[PDB]
Amino acid sequence: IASKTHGYVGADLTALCRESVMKTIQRGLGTDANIDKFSLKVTLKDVESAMVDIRPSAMREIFLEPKVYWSDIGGQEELKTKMKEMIQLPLEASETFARLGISAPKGVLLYGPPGCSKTLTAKALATESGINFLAVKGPEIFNKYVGESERAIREIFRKARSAAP
Amino acid sequence: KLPAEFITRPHPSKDHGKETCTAYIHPNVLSSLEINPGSFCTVGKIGENGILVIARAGDEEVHPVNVITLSTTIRSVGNLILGDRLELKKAQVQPPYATKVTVGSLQGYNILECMEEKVIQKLLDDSGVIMPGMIFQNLKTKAGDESIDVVITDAFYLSPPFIFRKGSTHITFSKETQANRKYNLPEPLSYAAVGGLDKEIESLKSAIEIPLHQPTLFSSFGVSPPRGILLHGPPGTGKTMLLRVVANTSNAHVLTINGPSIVSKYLGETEAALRDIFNEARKYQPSIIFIDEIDSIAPNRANDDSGEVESRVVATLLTLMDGMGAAGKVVVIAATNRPNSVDPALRRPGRFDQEVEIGIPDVDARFDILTKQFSRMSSDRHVLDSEAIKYIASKTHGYVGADLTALCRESVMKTIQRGLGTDANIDKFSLKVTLKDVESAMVDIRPSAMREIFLEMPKVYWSDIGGQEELKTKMKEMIQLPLEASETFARLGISAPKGVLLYGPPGCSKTLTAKALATESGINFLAVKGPEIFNKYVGESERAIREIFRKARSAAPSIIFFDEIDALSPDRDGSSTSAANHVLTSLLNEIDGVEELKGVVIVAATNRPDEIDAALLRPGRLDRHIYVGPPDVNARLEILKKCTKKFNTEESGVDLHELADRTEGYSGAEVVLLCQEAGLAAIMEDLDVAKVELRHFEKAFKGIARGITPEMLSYYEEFALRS
Amino acid sequence: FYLSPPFIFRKGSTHITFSKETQANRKYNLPEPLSYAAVGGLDKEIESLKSAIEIPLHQPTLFSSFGVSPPRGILLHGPPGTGKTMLLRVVANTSNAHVLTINGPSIVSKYLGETEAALRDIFNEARKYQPSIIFIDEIDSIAPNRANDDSGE
Amino acid sequence: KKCTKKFNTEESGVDLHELADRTEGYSGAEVVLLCQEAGLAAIMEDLDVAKVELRHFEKAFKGIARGITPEMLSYYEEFALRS
Amino acid sequence: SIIFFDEIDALSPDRDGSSTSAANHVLTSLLNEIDGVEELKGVVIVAATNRPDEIDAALLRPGRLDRHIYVGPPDVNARLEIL
Amino acid sequence: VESRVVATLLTLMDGMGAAGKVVVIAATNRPNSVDPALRRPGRFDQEVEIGIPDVDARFDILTKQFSRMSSDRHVLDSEAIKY
């Protein structure tokens, strides 16, 4: 249920539980003709029905977080090794960089043919690594924010900087 | 003190006789009005020429000064719902003796219990009787179970007072559903009046009964059941009627927010009134709060930054409503014309989570509404069988139901005017109501809600299409599986196609095939016009897409059809506009996204895929392709079969095979145009003709041209090969 | 009627029974106080809030000796429905210090000096007692941006 | 292999090497689409089916197209060489 | 009644000189008013244009403004009669 | 509450005598938003401009703050403050 509760938040979860309880009560009243509520209990099917019935009120989120492992991608392990040991150094070997010197690469470019799995590989790496991951879609933020795009960019950058590497 | 208004409460005492025709008024009020206890008191609902003379006076200090109790026996006549203000008048008239009285029965049973001991014992205690015939629960029917209600119809002033004495007058037994119409007595609203919203009314009844009648269950559950119900829909759908009927059918207290009347120039007056009404609702356990036109009372704070009489009232009402205890049984009802203008704070699923959606009635719902209206109307004043009502409902599509009431009223006006004009004030019994007058009124007045978010195209069967059944079978096996075999898909894994693209030459029957499949399937069908949403709304197109998608998701799995999508993606030809990019990205992130979207199936039709960007045509979205090209010989022959069946064929000297062979290069629209031209040519000579000759067909064929070039067909073929 | 009817206790008339219950009977509709375990999933945030309330309140002498102007305002910002009001209610219930809240629009009236007088009175009351906590809800509605809206009424 | 793990493989009558050889010109999204089409073709025959044959896979491969032209690949390669 | 338009070429400028929002709005309005759910039996629509080149192809479809009249220059008889 | 206040402030400032040793000083975040009548060099001719302190000024402020805090509660060298 929690995995299928990505969009809901707090009061949304409470409203979903309340809707599930209401659906259970209504189903019991309709079927068993006012039977004792002790035996009605709560079923996962009713929870799913309530979740379908009422959508989250916070669907529009500035940052988007699904967990996926390395078994799903099934890559050559060459690109996987590249992604594993090109960006792990700046986040973990900060002291090594400080003592040795030089500057971090601080940049990754992913260009490829359409229909590839760059996003899937990035999500798998983010799930495998313990570092916090923030993903924001490009066209969906600057298109509808003629002047608020700068504010959103500053907000996401400062949130990423403050909330750990 | 000077109490301008009084509140109403039922009598705690049981049984009948003692509780009826009695009042519980504080002695201080009676002393100010110098009303003797052995006199008659008049109560009126804020006026409306109401008198309602009743006997006896109040006693005991247990009740507050403002509250006055007169039981529901009298309130059932003048529709004196709980919470209505009452007025006391000093003037009174001594009732005279009644005569030639009669008694009826609300139920089907007529003339039962002639001894009527309960009625007989009521004779001695009948003081201050009134003509409208107080409705009694009848208690126990002296074996036989059930209960029979009694009503008296015959016995300036709304109801003339009378004195009932045994022996002087004779009681007559009869049966009538309601009172006589010559006395213009109000008719209480019942659930039978509301029709076409059985699911909606059932949901409202459940959402009212659960927190009110059984609050202890949720109190033990510790869930804090919601106290706010939102009814959002187009105007004229009977939301006010629903609010009124749910109040009438419920014995709990009813409180209605006036809105603008409550709001005054004083800043604290609104807060004081809201606090007073909330305290009154909380003091008595059974009570229902009604807020008519919540949108006007509580507008969007973000849209309009008005802190004068908008922000403060919203804040205070939300704080008061959030602060009530869970053990109480109080329900707040809010009705709005549009949910978008409602403030998002009130739309948060913490205060108004329970939302009831009311839409435009479909064919069966409209037919049910018409039948209910005709049954409510006197049956002897009109004759209309089932087929006539079905035809009227089919011809009635843009009307909302207030439009239906207006149509009925205009039909009555037209019938009266025609009768007086023609027959020179004849008796209205013979005039009756004719379908021709109804059609004339329908032509006269256009629907007030023609602009609709979704269009319900009347049903069409497979016989009209007359296809080769190959494309029909393909569509049957394509999109029916994700709608019915969801469990099979889950067992087998993978994902649903969740997309169908209908690209073909202009003048085809892709829309006709989609409509026929929607008619054949029992699943709900939703249709959206392409150019009618994004072009009209430069910025509101995104909100329209959001609301239509959420409505489709909520109202069960369904198939959505778009007439045109080529104009929806002009990002490649003639530059890219902000609205075009917005609608394109909305379509993309709705078709593919975090949501699995299994039940929802999207079908898109376009005139040419040239105006469609390659982003839309990607694997996993609209992958399936249908040629839906021009009809073949069999389809043209079968569609010409209907035309040949319309008139006589054997003596017309035409053969189906030769007609199909000659007209092989035309499409269905071209075939229909040729048939229409041939029919017009045939009927132009010798006026009406029972048959059409082949010369007319040849003239129609030579006069008109198909207008289709082979290059576009080759382009479509190579696009299909490329895809 | 009555939230809780009064009772009279005397020896011998009634017999005392020993049991164990987390709360009282549900039929008495008594409000249930919210504890720390009521809210979950915000361990870091709740720990930060706990430190930010404990250090200035329980240990004012250390910062007075430091003279580093200890902070007095704690800002809780986030999407609606996250549970900020729950944190405020929990910290109000679990703290024995004085609790004061501002209605906001209700306090604001047509008189320009009435709001100022009410604010002066409420902060004077807060300063009268050494342990005090001030709660303000919907500051943006009460005090919007001056640059965005040029309304000084 | 991950896609076919849902059902059996012993009685499917398909070999791993030829499946990769035939679908060499496709991509991961194309492979997923082909698998979905093959599953749909299998389930539209004889109602529910517990297995899928090679004929369904061949039909799905024939019906669908990769939709990618080598000029984009050459442009990407020359951009990579330039960068 | 019969509805006659003095000019209709300027009503569909969507093909020449770009496509303004108002032009598209009026074009779709006339289109869905001429053809729609309403039968529109008594109402007759007559369209007049100086040059049919400025008319969009989507307007010229069967069932909508299909009938065409050459209405060319008058002959010697008509010219004599009007003279 | 703006034009009248500005006008009366200007009148009062112009009415101050030379003998009287009365001075009025005000602080503003932005000088551009200030009314140019006040900015005219007849009532507010003297102006004190404070900009962004450089590294040396910041270092001096930090050293002064740490000296006020006193070393009994912290230990740091000049290199740390400079960094």
Author numbering:
A (entry chain F): 445 to 509, 511 to 610
B (entry chain A): 29 to 183, 209 to 776
C (entry chain F): 209 to 361
D (entry chain F): 694 to 776
E (entry chain B): 611 to 693
F (entry chain E): 362 to 444
Describing publication, verbatim:
The type II AAA + ATPase Drg1 is a ribosome assembly factor, functioning to release Rlp24 from the pre-60S particle just exported from nucleus, and its activity in can be inhibited by a drug molecule diazaborine. Here, we report Drg1 structures in different nucleotide-binding and benzo-diazaborine treated states. All structures display a typical three-layered architecture, similar to those of type II AAA + hexamers, such as p97/VCP and Cdc48, and the NTD, D1, and D2 rings show an apparent deviation from a perfect sixfold symmetry. Comparisons of these structures indicate that Drg1 hexamers transit between two extreme conformations, a planar and a helical state.
The cryo-EM map of Drg1 hexamers treated with ATP/benzo-diazaborine was resolved at a resolution of 3.8 Å (without symmetry imposed). Notably, compared with structures from other samples, this structure is more symmetrical at both the D1 and D2 rings, and the six protomers are roughly in a same conformation. While the six D2 ATPase sites in the structure of the ATP/benzo-diazaborine dataset are fully occupied by ATP, the six D2 sites in the structures from the ADP/AMPPNP/benzo-diazaborine dataset are not saturated and appear to be partially occupied by ADP. Benzo-diazaborine is docked in equivalent sites of the D1 and D2 domain. On the D1 domain, benzo-diazaborine is surround by I422, T458, R297, and R429. Importantly, benzo-diazaborine contains an extra benzyl group, which is coordinated by R429 through a cation-π interaction. Therefore, benzo-diazaborine should have also formed covalent bonds with the 2′-OH of the ribose of the ATP molecules in the ATPase centers of both the D1 and D2 domains. While the NTD and D1 remain largely as a rigid body in all these comparisons, the D2 domain of the Drg1-ATP/benzo-diazaborine complex displays a distinct conformation that is dissimilar to any of the six protomers from the mutant Drg1-ATP complex. These results suggest that benzo-diazaborine has locked the ATPase centers of Drg1 in a specific conformation and limited its conformational transition. In summary, benzo-diazaborine blocks the ATP hydrolysis cycle and hinders the conformational changes of the D1 and D2 rings, thereby disabling the conformational cycling of Drg1 subunits required for substrate processing.
